Write an enzyme that holds these catalytic residues in place. Structure first.
Site, PDB file in Angstrom:
ATOM      1  N   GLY A 178      64.088 -37.908 -26.303  1.00 32.63           N
ATOM      2  CA  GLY A 178      64.381 -36.505 -26.621  1.00 32.63           C
ATOM      3  C   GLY A 178      63.931 -36.065 -28.010  1.00 32.63           C
ATOM      4  O   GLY A 178      63.313 -36.818 -28.784  1.00 32.63           O
ATOM      5  N   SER A 219      61.912 -37.680 -33.463  1.00 33.89           N
ATOM      6  CA  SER A 219      61.571 -37.793 -32.033  1.00 33.89           C
ATOM      7  C   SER A 219      61.383 -39.269 -31.643  1.00 33.89           C
ATOM      8  O   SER A 219      60.655 -40.012 -32.326  1.00 33.89           O
ATOM      9  CB  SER A 219      60.303 -36.981 -31.716  1.00 33.89           C
ATOM     10  OG  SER A 219      59.642 -37.460 -30.548  1.00 33.89           O
ATOM     11  N   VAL A 264      65.188 -34.328 -31.588  1.00 36.17           N
ATOM     12  CA  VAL A 264      66.438 -34.458 -32.324  1.00 36.17           C
ATOM     13  C   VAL A 264      66.428 -33.542 -33.542  1.00 36.17           C
ATOM     14  O   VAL A 264      65.449 -33.555 -34.302  1.00 36.17           O
ATOM     15  CB  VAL A 264      66.695 -35.918 -32.808  1.00 36.17           C
ATOM     16  CG1 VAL A 264      68.048 -36.000 -33.437  1.00 36.17           C
ATOM     17  CG2 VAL A 264      66.578 -36.916 -31.671  1.00 36.17           C
ATOM     18  N   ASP A 314      67.123 -54.778 -25.848  1.00 31.76           N
ATOM     19  CA  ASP A 314      66.067 -54.035 -26.506  1.00 31.76           C
ATOM     20  C   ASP A 314      66.448 -53.394 -27.843  1.00 31.76           C
ATOM     21  O   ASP A 314      65.965 -52.298 -28.136  1.00 31.76           O
ATOM     22  CB  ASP A 314      65.513 -52.998 -25.566  1.00 31.76           C
ATOM     23  CG  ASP A 314      64.055 -52.575 -25.917  1.00 31.76           C
ATOM     24  OD1 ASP A 314      63.327 -53.206 -26.747  1.00 31.76           O
ATOM     25  OD2 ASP A 314      63.628 -51.582 -25.331  1.00 31.76           O
TER      26      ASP A 314
HETATM   27  N1  LIG Z   1      71.659 -38.515 -37.211  1.00 31.30           N
HETATM   28  C1  LIG Z   1      70.715 -38.911 -36.714  1.00 31.30           C
HETATM   29  C2  LIG Z   1      69.624 -39.390 -36.117  1.00 31.30           C
HETATM   30  C3  LIG Z   1      69.335 -39.595 -34.689  1.00 31.30           C
HETATM   31  N2  LIG Z   1      70.148 -39.313 -33.709  1.00 31.30           N
HETATM   32  C4  LIG Z   1      69.831 -39.346 -32.393  1.00 31.30           C
HETATM   33  O1  LIG Z   1      68.848 -39.863 -31.927  1.00 31.30           O
HETATM   34  C5  LIG Z   1      70.888 -38.726 -31.547  1.00 31.30           C
HETATM   35  C6  LIG Z   1      71.466 -37.499 -31.922  1.00 31.30           C
HETATM   36  C7  LIG Z   1      72.503 -36.949 -31.182  1.00 31.30           C
HETATM   37  C8  LIG Z   1      73.025 -37.597 -30.078  1.00 31.30           C
HETATM   38  C9  LIG Z   1      72.536 -38.835 -29.654  1.00 31.30           C
HETATM   39  C10 LIG Z   1      73.048 -39.484 -28.530  1.00 31.30           C
HETATM   40  C11 LIG Z   1      72.529 -40.710 -28.140  1.00 31.30           C
HETATM   41  C12 LIG Z   1      71.454 -41.296 -28.843  1.00 31.30           C
HETATM   42  C13 LIG Z   1      70.908 -40.696 -29.957  1.00 31.30           C
HETATM   43  C14 LIG Z   1      71.421 -39.469 -30.381  1.00 31.30           C
HETATM   44  S1  LIG Z   1      67.721 -40.186 -34.529  1.00 31.30           S
HETATM   45  C15 LIG Z   1      67.412 -40.224 -36.226  1.00 31.30           C
HETATM   46  C16 LIG Z   1      68.553 -39.787 -37.025  1.00 31.30           C
HETATM   47  C17 LIG Z   1      68.496 -39.691 -38.524  1.00 31.30           C
HETATM   48  C18 LIG Z   1      67.330 -40.521 -39.030  1.00 31.30           C
HETATM   49  N3  LIG Z   1      66.111 -40.370 -38.232  1.00 31.30           N
HETATM   50  C19 LIG Z   1      64.909 -40.136 -38.831  1.00 31.30           C
HETATM   51  O2  LIG Z   1      63.879 -40.635 -38.357  1.00 31.30           O
HETATM   52  C20 LIG Z   1      64.878 -39.206 -40.058  1.00 31.30           C
HETATM   53  C21 LIG Z   1      63.874 -39.592 -41.163  1.00 31.30           C
HETATM   54  N4  LIG Z   1      62.490 -39.571 -40.656  1.00 31.30           N
HETATM   55  C22 LIG Z   1      61.611 -40.330 -41.560  1.00 31.30           C
HETATM   56  C23 LIG Z   1      60.236 -40.471 -40.896  1.00 31.30           C
HETATM   57  C24 LIG Z   1      59.642 -39.114 -40.532  1.00 31.30           C
HETATM   58  C25 LIG Z   1      60.666 -38.239 -39.808  1.00 31.30           C
HETATM   59  C26 LIG Z   1      61.988 -38.197 -40.580  1.00 31.30           C
HETATM   60  C27 LIG Z   1      66.134 -40.750 -36.799  1.00 31.30           C
END
Ligand SMILES: N#Cc1c(NC(=O)c2cccc3ccccc23)sc2c1CCN(C(=O)CCN1CCCCC1)C2
Length: 331
Positions: A31, A27, A33, A144
């Site tokens: 949004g 998050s 995710v 940013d």
């Molecule tokens: N793959 C992927 C992904 C993201 N994607 C998006 O934010 C996202 C998904 C779909 C469409 C999107 C369109 C535009 C911007 C972002 C978009 S955000 C995000 C990821 C993958 C790694 N992420 C994590 O934070 C996972 C590991 N965390 C460690 C700390 C505690 C919680 C678990 C952050």
């Protein structure tokens, strides 16, 4: 019915039937995710839910712009979408937008926590730099860049997930300002190399494992900048609008530290001649990126030439925002 609903986090995801086995990824401000399996592509995807993007002009301006700019941008280091949908059947019904991308594995934050490695760090900086050059070429200055909106895969491939700022909400979620350039901190007008400062910040943090320029807000943050890098000298002040100039000139002065004391050799490996050399090149790049005055800070082109790096070489009501966004989804 071509959608189904399911209760991830304390959210409801109503998603196309192709996307199965939803699990919370994370998050941000924007949004919720989820990780999912996409049966049609037979691979793993990430899905972001935007809940009522048109609820205020900030959320709405951002949502619209990120949908238009995604479609129209194309680079391996910048998000691209597999799919965009709403489960809602009409404009009158419309509530939520869903964005689908290929699943990446980690945040840069988790990567900054890993011990320093020159092959990895340089390749990541190279990629962040090629992405930014791509944005700048398309008319996009980010302003940013922060590690929370940069993702990586296990094979060290990297993508920037957002397009930054254009040009208040009643929500306790607080923005991260630590990576913002002086010209953003001080409201100064900027050009392309504004994004080099932020890469400098992430890079310094990879070496130091500590946010370089923390603070409750920009007052604190500016203090942190000046006391490590020293007070900018005279001819930077002269491009500061009259009121900002007064304030900057009246903080207690600091000499500033040399980069070797800022990033001691103790923070790097010295086990081989290769690592000794890479250490002095890294620090040379930091010294060129963490430059307060943008006239003296390195450009994106010069940075991708640097030998550390080159081994790899506008006013609407919420009813009006709702429609603009719905249209760009359906289109
Ligand atoms: N793959 C992927 C992904 C993201 N994607 C998006 O934010 C996202 C998904 C779909 C469409 C999107 C369109 C535009 C911007 C972002 C978009 S955000 C995000 C990821 C993958 C790694 N992420 C994590 O934070 C996972 C590991 N965390 C460690 C700390 C505690 C919680 C678990 C952050």
């Amino acid at each position: 019915n071509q959608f189904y609903s399911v209760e991830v986090g304390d959210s409801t995801f109503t998603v196309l039937k192709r996307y199965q086995n939803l699990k919370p990824i994370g998050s941000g401000a924007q949004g919720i995710v989820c990780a999912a399996y996409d049966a049609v592509l037979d691979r793993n995807v990430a899905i972001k839910k935007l809940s009522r993007p048109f609820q205020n002009q900030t959320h709405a301006k951002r949502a619209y712009r990120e949908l238009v700019l995604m479609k129209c941008v194309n680079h391996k280091n910048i998000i691209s979408l597999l799919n965009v949908f709403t489960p809602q059947k009409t404009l009158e019904e419309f509530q939520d937008v869903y964005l689908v991308m290929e699943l990446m594995d980690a945040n840069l934050c988790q990567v900054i926590q890993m011990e320093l490695d020159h092959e990895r760090m340089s390749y990541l900086l190279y990629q962040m730099l090629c992405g930014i050059k791509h944005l700048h070429s398309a008319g996009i200055i980010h302003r940013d860049l922060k590690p929370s909106n940069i993702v990586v895969k296990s094979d060290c491939t990297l993508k920037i997930l957002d397009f930054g700022l254009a040009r208040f909400m009643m929500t306790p979620y607080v923005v991260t300002r630590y990576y913002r350039a002086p010209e953003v901190i001080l409201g100064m007008g900027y050009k392309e190399n504004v994004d080099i400062w932020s890469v400098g910040c992430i890079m310094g943090e990879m070496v130091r494992h500590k946010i370089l320029f923390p603070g409750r807000d920009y007052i604190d943050q500016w203090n942190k900048v000046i006391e490590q890098l020293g007070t900018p000298c005279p001819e930077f002040m002269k491009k500061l609008q009259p009121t900002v100039r007064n304030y900057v000139e009246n903080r207690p002065k600091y000499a500033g530290l040399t980069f070797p004391k800022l990033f001691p050799d103790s923070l790097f490996p010295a086990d081989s001649e290769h690592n000794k050399l890479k250490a002095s090149q890294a620090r040379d790049l930091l010294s060129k990126m963490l430059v307060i005055d943008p006239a003296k800070r390195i450009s994106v082109d010069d940075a991708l030439q640097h030998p550390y790096i080159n081994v790899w070489y506008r006013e609407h009501t919420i009813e009006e925002w709702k429609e603009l966004i719905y249209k760009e989804v359906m289109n």
